[PDB]
């Protein structure tokens, strides 16, 4: 059923996945959110939103566990690389799984991808003196894609056509790979970057670009999800009155953090925000207040140590207050069960 507690535990699974993939899959399975078969997890990982592409790659990229190996085989076996050049296939593979990072992870992803490519194109492998060259060429394409489209590497230090060629010299069991073969790859990658589909993290990146000042704090971690944006007015003193537009603050509520900001510069569909403060949802309580001067007040509190008053707002209207305080209150619950589950360290200390 579309139960609040039920839904809330789905999302708790996803958050565990986006921090500790092995733990998150266990969690989703132990509750019947995804089947305990490699095929079932495969389709989950590549079909369900709420899953970070970086950790789908960290999960599949694990070579030790046999289950993880088995799911990667189901993933590649559901991709069709026939009649494709090796880069055109990588474009399709890198579309679902981020291939980048710890070399042991990129090895196991590329290994699984190349094997699938060989099966879909036996005529291409016959053109090679050694079939393993397909792995080396694949890895090369990843690396070229990273460098050609890296902002830290300025054009002048970027890998040019003959740099690429020169690096793949004499690797096909002593012989070069055909120059016209490598040149097609380079032009195709040059014509459009191998991009991975956007996930919740790429929404958090957009936001974090628009907010100057931060205390860190990165903000775009894998587990963190944008939940809600809201315009409320900070109330320094809820016992004194204040002018209806004073202290206007734009509030970004993420699934485990509330960020308070003020508009820095407004313009035609282009706004920046100055970061003011952020609060952790662990131990937060959300109170409503109505008095002589504020009819839609919100007071936020930190019960964890005596009770602390974090911040007071007043929303524009009572509908906004009810949407905001409900979203924040469910996030606070979501975070409470995350730590209530995280005090599992009793089974980790023997
Ligand atoms: C420095 C600075 C800049 C803008 C601000 C504030 C502050 N500050 O003094 O912290 C506020 O406190 C509230 C608010 C308002 F403009 F409405 F008064 O916007």
The CATH number assigned to the domain with range 200-342 reads 2.30.29.30
- Cβ neighbourhood burial of 145 (10 Å; 0-12, 13-18, 19+): buried
Ligand 1, atom 8: nearest CA belongs to which residue?
A: 247
Sign of CA dihedral 43, 45, 46, 51: positive
Distance CA 230, CA 321 (A): 9
Resolution in A: 2.5
Q: What angle do CA 342, 344, 348 make, to 5 degrees?
A: 125
262 CB near ligand 1 (under 6 Å): yes
Between the CA of residue 196 and those of 41, 91, 94, 151, 274, what are the distances in Å?
A: 20, 8, 6, 17, 30
**Strand, coil or helix: what is 91?**
helix
Alpha helices (H) in 173-317, listed in sequence order: 179-191, 200-209
Exactly one of 102, 187, 193, 198 is catalytic; which is it? 102
Contacts of residues 246-253 at CB distance under 8 Å and 24 or more positions apart, as own/partner, are 249/276, 249/313, 251/313, 251/324, 252/207, 252/211, 252/226, 252/228, 253/226, 253/227, 253/228, 253/229, 253/324, 253/327, 253/328, 253/331
**Helix H or strand E segment including 74:** helix 66-77
Domain boundaries, the chain: 4-191, 200-342
Number of Cβ within 10 Å of residue 265's Cβ equals: 10
**What is the whole-number distance in angstroms between the Cα of residue 246 and the centre of ligand 1?**
8
**Closest of 238, 287, 295, 233 to residue 260, by C-alpha:** 233
What residues are paired with 275 via a beta bridge? 261
263 CB near ligand 1 (under 6 Å): no
Give domain 4-191's CATH architecture: Orthogonal Bundle (1.10)
Is position 175 annotated as part of the catalytic site? Answer: no
CB 160 within 8 A of CB 186: no
């Amino acid at each position: 059923s579309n139960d609040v507690i039920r839904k809330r535990h789905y999302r708790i699974g996803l958050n565990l996945f986006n921090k500790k993939p092995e733990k998150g899959v266990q969690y989703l399975i132990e509750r019947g959110f995804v089947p305990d078969t490699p095929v079932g997890v495969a389709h989950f990982l590549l079909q369900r939103k709420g899953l970070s592409r970086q950790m789908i790659g960290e999960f599949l990229g694990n070579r030790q566990k046999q289950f993880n190996r088995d799911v990667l085989d189901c993933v590649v076996d559901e991709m069709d690389f026939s009649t494709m050049e090796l880069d055109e296939a990588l474009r399709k593979f890198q579309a679902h799984i981020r291939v980048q990072g710890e070399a042991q992870k990129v090895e196991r992803l590329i290994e699984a991808f190349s094997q699938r490519y060989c099966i879909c194109n036996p005529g291409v492998v016959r053109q090679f003196r050694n079939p393993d060259t397909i792995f080396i060429l694949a890895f090369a394409i990843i690396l070229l894609n990273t460098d050609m489209y890296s902002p830290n590497v300025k054009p002048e230090r970027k890998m040019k056509l003959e740099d690429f060629i020169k690096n793949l010299r004499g690797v096909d069991d002593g012989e070069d790979i055909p120059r016209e073969m490598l040149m097609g790859i380079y032009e195709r990658i040059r014509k459009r970057e191998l991009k991975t589909n956007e996930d919740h993290v790429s929404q958090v990146q957009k936001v974090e670009k628009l907010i100057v000042g931060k205390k860190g704090c990165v903000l775009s971690l894998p587990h963190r999800r944008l939940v809600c944006y809201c315009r409320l007015f900070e109330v320094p003193d809820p016992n004194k009155p204040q002018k209806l537009g004073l202290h206007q603050r734009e509030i970004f509520l993420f699934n485990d953090l509330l960020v308070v900001t003020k508009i820095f510069q407004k313009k035609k569909n282009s706004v920046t925000y100055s970061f003011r403060q952020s609060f952790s949802l662990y131990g937060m309580q959300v109170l409503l207040f109505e008095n002589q001067y504020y009819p839609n007040g919100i007071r936020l509190t930190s019960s964890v140590a005596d009770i602390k008053v974090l911040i007071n707002f007043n929303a524009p209207n009572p509908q906004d207050r009810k949407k905001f305080t409900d979203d924040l209150r469910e996030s606070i619950a979501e975070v409470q069960e995350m730590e209530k589950h995280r005090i599992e360290s009793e089974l980790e200390k023997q």
